Amino acid sequence: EELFTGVVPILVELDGDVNGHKFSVRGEGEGDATNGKLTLKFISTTGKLPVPWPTLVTTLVQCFSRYPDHMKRHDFFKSAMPEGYVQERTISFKDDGTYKTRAEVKFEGDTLVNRIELKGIDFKEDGNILGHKLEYNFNCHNVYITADKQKNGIKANFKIRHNVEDGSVQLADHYQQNTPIDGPVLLPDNHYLSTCSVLSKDPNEKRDHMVLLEFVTA
Numbered sequence: 539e540e541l542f543t544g545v546v547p548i549l550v551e552l553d554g555d556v557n558g559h560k561f562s563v564r565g566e567g568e569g570d571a572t573n574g575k576l577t578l579k580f581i582s583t584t585g586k587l588p589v590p591w592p593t594l595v596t597t598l599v600q601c602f603s604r605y606p607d608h609m610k611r612h613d614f615f616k617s618a619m620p621e622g623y624v625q626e627r628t629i630s631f632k633d634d635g636t637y638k639t640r641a642e643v644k645f646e647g648d649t650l651v652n653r654i655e656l657k658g659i660d661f662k663e664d665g666n667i668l669g670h671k672l673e674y675n676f677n678c679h680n681v682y683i684t685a686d687k688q689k690n691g692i693k694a695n696f697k698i699r700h701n702v703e704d705g706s707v708q709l710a711d712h713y714q715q716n717t718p719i720d721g722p723v724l725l726p727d728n729h730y731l732s733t734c735s736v737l738s739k740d741p742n743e744k745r746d747h748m749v750l751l752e753f754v755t756a
Contacts, residue, residue, distance in 0.1 A: 542571035542601070542616055547649040548578060550598055556658030557635070557668060559588035565598060569650060571616070574604025574754045582746035589658070590672040591748040592700050595735060596712060597627065597639050599652050600681075603731055603754040613756070614683075614692050614716065617724030620645030623691070623716050629698075632709035635661035644719065666700070666708045673701040676735040681714075685725045692716035692726065731756055 550565035567578030580591075580598060587594075601615035615623065622644020629637040641654040661668045679698055686693045694714040702708050736751040 539616060539619055541619060541645065544572075545570055546602070548576070548599060548602075548652070549646075549649055550578065550580065550652045550654070552594070552598060552654040552656060554589075554656040554658065556588050556637075556656075557661045557663065559668070560584065561587055561589070563587075563594065563598065569599065569602040571602045571604070574602060574756075576602055576750070576752040576754070578750050578752075579740065579743075580748045580750065581743070586746045589667050590670055590700070591674065591746075592672055592676050592737065593629075593631075593637075593667055593710065594748075595676055595737075595750070596629070596698060596710075597637070597641070597654055597656060598750075599643060599650060600625075600731065600754065601643065601650065603756050605756045609729065609756060611724065612726035612729055614718075614724050614726050615643075618718035621719045623718050625714065625716050627715075628713045630711045630713075631661075631667060632711070634665045634667055634708075635659055642719070666702050671703045672708060673703055674737055675701055676737050677701075678732065678734040681712075681731040681733065683726055683730060684728050686715060686717075687725065689715065689717045690723065690725060691718060729756055 546569045552563040554561045562583045565580035605613045625641045627639045638657045643652045698710040700708040733754045738749045
């Protein structure tokens with residue numbers, strides 16, 4: 539279950555629907571679990587995204603978190619591998635609409651894959667999300683996990699904060715549940731994850747794209 543030494547390959551596939559605007563993202567990159575570093579590039583295979591890239595970051599692989607030597611046993615994410623887990627989130631933008639996401643995260647071959655459905659409903663076509671009024675950045679957030687023994691897995695809740703192009707700040711409340719898809723697996727006690735992100739572009743890629751680096755530690 540420790541497939542997580544060395545540079546592991548990542549594929550991410552998301553299919554979205556925000557207010558009927560449909561889009562599709564594919565991303566490929568590397569994950570270094572031992573250092574908790576993710577390096578990825580994402581592309582829109584459906585022309586310019588209806589929504590801002592930063593609001594997709596949390597949706598677009600927490601098994602690659604760096605888990606300390608001391609607490610290495612409260613790592614649900616690798617523990618359910620490679621059957622995978624189901625990660626479900628409800629992301630509720632304050633004063634705007636909400637995303638539903640169901641994702642299966644598991645191994646095909648040597649490769650870690652994250653397959654996402656995202657349904658977005660109730661968005662203003664003129665607020666910060668559908669109106670593309672959000673800056674292209676991403677701060678550091680700490681994701682508060684807890685054991686959900688009633689499904690054998692994880693519940694997190696956390697607030698993401700998107701800087702808005704007008705000095706205001708847009709709130710995105712995340713609720714998250716993770717279940718293990720199959721035998722017994724680990725049940726963390728009560729820890730959180732410190733995640734920081736660098737968002738950037740590739741001067742060569744023409745399609746809607748986000749290049750992304752990330753460090754995650756437990």
